Amino acid sequence: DPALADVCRTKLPSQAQDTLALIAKNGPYPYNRDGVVFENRESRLPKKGNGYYHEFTVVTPGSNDRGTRRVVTGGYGEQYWSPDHYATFQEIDPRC
Template sequence: MKRAGRGSLVLALICLAAVVWLVVRTMAGGSEDGTAGAPAGETAPPSTFATFPSATPSASSAPATSAVPKPSPPPSRPSATPSPSPTPTPSVADTGPTGTDTRDWDGIDACRDSILPPELDEVADDVEDGGPFAYPGKDGSTFGNYEGYLPDERRGYYREYTVETPGLHHRGARRIITGGDARDPEVWYYTDDHYETFCEFAP
């Protein structure tokens, strides 16, 4: 009976040693792949070390520097001394025909300005421009000086032109008599009584 009891005890010890060996081997294999002690099918717990971002910011994360506008230059101040304005040249007013005695030897006096009508100026301008005239065929024709009131000159020297009288529907009695060139006369006479009297003027 003692031998049977010892045999059973030895067998039990051998079985216990085998179990211990298996447990130790299993634990040693699990520690090699980092999953020791974890049940099958479960993942290892996450690491307890927190990951912090780099202290040095990247170039893309740096804030953009806004462009600072340059101050505009101050406006220039006007000169304290104003530049003098040009002095306007006074224009010579056209006073129109005036009484002038250009031939003091002919015995004909200068016209009084008061008797020279406003219409005389326009006719004098037409004479110097060569026309047109109010009465073509009459104005610019030769004045014969048959009465001899004007100095004797060659035929064709004198020409006559009509100075119209407002309100009349015919030539009237007012005339200009010129002597010399047709457009640049040497002398100008005026009559307001149809060649009865003459006076001298300049246009």
């Protein structure tokens, strides 16, 4: 499989848009876990080979802690948003 919901890039929180711009430039990244492989063990994203997906933190400005906001990239430049630490995903639509 079923489709994921879509979110327009310009409808993302500003910090999420900032993270997409960092990914496009290959960093630098605020967190040491930025860029590590996302294994997708439970297959909420389409099942792919080892290392296809990577995860990045999106800053939560009003908290002291890292927070739950994430972007996951795929190997063909697909981008996914998760506001809730991977419980839900939306595919980012770069066109809008």
